[PDB]
Amino acid sequence: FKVATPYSLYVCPEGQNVTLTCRLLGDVTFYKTWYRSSRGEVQTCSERRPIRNLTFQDLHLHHGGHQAANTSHDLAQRHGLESASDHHGNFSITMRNLTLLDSGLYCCLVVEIRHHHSEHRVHGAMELQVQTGKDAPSNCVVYPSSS
Ligand SMILES: *[C@@H]1O[C@H](CO)[C@@H](O)[C@H](O)[C@H]1NC(C)=O
């Protein structure tokens, strides 16, 4: 049971939209959320820092394997953040109108809860650099995670 991050680096200009993506390979509930963190030597995605004033708890989803889930219209409208899990193990966070305060190390956490004492936690890490200089790209440049 594991998480694939297609892309480890996203380099976007201010004012763009970006979707950060994690993909799930593998009844049971899932807890899935997003937070900014840091890339430690032995542990990455431990510390849970806010994304634009919201926390992993605000952005979290809780859904069954036959189920999709997304954050509310009022969250999207108010914070320009949409977190969404489709039926195909695609888990994403869509950020509207990037500012330089959006840069950071983003983590998707996915918890498989098979039972009260049976939780498996997996995370994916990806950097978002929001650029502001004359050389900033016209839209997101993205760097694959692998091969
Ligand atoms: C970002 O997304 C919204 C759709 O919610 C759209 O109105 C806007 O044109 C988009 N901005 C860019 C730069 O694509």
Beta bridge partners of 83: 93
Distance CA 147, CA 90 (A): 20
Tell me, in angstroms, the distance from the centre of ligand 1 to residue 57's CA.
Answer: 26
Tell me, in angstroms, the distance from the centre of ligand 1 to residue 108's CA.
Answer: 23
Distance CA 118, CA 140 (A): 39
- Pair of tokens at residue 7: 């892309």
Number of domains in the chain: 1
**Amino acid letter for position 134:** K
What are the pocket residues of ligand 1 if the criterion is a CB atom closer than 6 Å to any ligand atom? 15-17, 96
Tell me, in angstroms, the distance from the centre of ligand 1 to residue 29's CA.
Answer: 33
Reported resolution, Å: 1.9
Which residues span the domain enclosing 59? Answer: 1-147
Distance CA 89, CA 9 (A): 21
* Structure solved via: X-ray
Strands 81-85 and 90-95: antiparallel
**Amino acid letter for position 86:** D
Beta bridge partners of 96: none
C-beta of residue 26 within 8 angstroms of C-beta of residue 2 = yes
Distance CA 3, CA 109 (A): 9
